[model samples]
Target: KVFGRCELAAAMKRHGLDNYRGYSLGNWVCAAKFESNFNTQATNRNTDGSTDYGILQINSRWWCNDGRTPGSRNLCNIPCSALLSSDITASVNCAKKIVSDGNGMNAWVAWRNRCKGTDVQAWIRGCRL
Candidate 1:
């Protein structure tokens, strides 16, 4: 499923992404906008044979077990396919782990290149949350 802007904002907020690890809800929303355009089933194959999955683009090399990524740690202890589901609970939970594990929001390059140090307020400006 592809989420509308406000819809994605509300969902991320419900999952406690608002100010998560000092990153604002707008930051998370902006990351999703560039990462997967809010599509639940988004996937991107990296040059290193790892694939990023789901809306937040959790990686198979370290975060999830796709059985295709070489030397995967599967730190999130989940099948990579789980991240593709529309529910988003697993992906959000894994994202929390990523942040808490000291990676911060910079774990996502999209966030670094697009959201970091930017006025992300526009990402959530019209949301009713």
Candidate 2:
């Protein structure tokens, strides 16, 4: 269930990135595109053997328990599979908490690897808010 660009923007706006310091709506959209291609069910295993869950690709090492990663911080206190669902409330909340903890968008590898220092306006170009 990949979201189109406009749909992704609307979701981000509705979820509120207003005070999400160090990241703009454009950065988020860009990262989301790179991270999961707007697919809510997206997940990946890192080269280091940790898993990233959901559209945001949150790490099992720090965020949630996927029943595989041991000693998971589970900072989000959520089952990792919950992030795979279309209902994004838990994922969104966890991500906000992650950023608010001073990690910024740097918490996401996708953001650092791709979105960082990149012109972000194209991410939301012509998208109806």
Candidate 3:
């Protein structure tokens, strides 16, 4: 519920994520859209029993501890609830690290499944920022 397409584009640009790792802002923006529509409190369970958290839908298998999931790597070292903040800082930081790990946005199934090979520039058509 944090943003529509335009606001999210501006926010991502403000955070310097527009061209992060040589990828387009739409890369991240597209992934966020298909995953949770930029909702901070978003979460969903994977078929493998791992849960995805936050706007990026980071997996519980390696990102955060939810206390109910086994074999949690908790590599982010924060609780799952921390990603559900109105402030995007924590989740953004975690997502950056995840992308840096060589997965890029491809770590997200939503990105691989839906965002790839599409009209990326359309994501921020009317943003004044």
Q: Candidate 1: where are CA atoms >4 Å away? A: none
Q: Quote each prediction's TM-score.
A: 0.96, 0.91, 0.90
Query: Can you write out model 1's per-residue Cα lDDT over 1-129, one digit (the tens) per residue?
Result: 899999999999999988989888999889998999999899999999999999899999999999998787899999999999988889888998988887799999999999999999899998999
Top of the candidates by lDDT: 1
lDDT ranking from best candidate downward: 1, 2, 3
Q: After superposition, how far is residue 76 of candidate 1 from its true place, in Å?
A: 0.9
Arrange candidates by TM-score, highest first: which order? 1, 2, 3
Q: List the residue pairs that clash in candidate 1.
A: none
The most accurate candidate by TM-score is 1
Candidate with the larger TM-score of 1 and 3: 1
2 against 3, candidate with superior TM-score: 2
The per-residue C-alpha lDDT of model 1 at residue 33 equals 89
Residue-level lDDT of model 2, residues 22-128, one tens digit each, is 57778888888899988889989987667887778888988888888876688999998988888766778788878877778999888999988998868878988
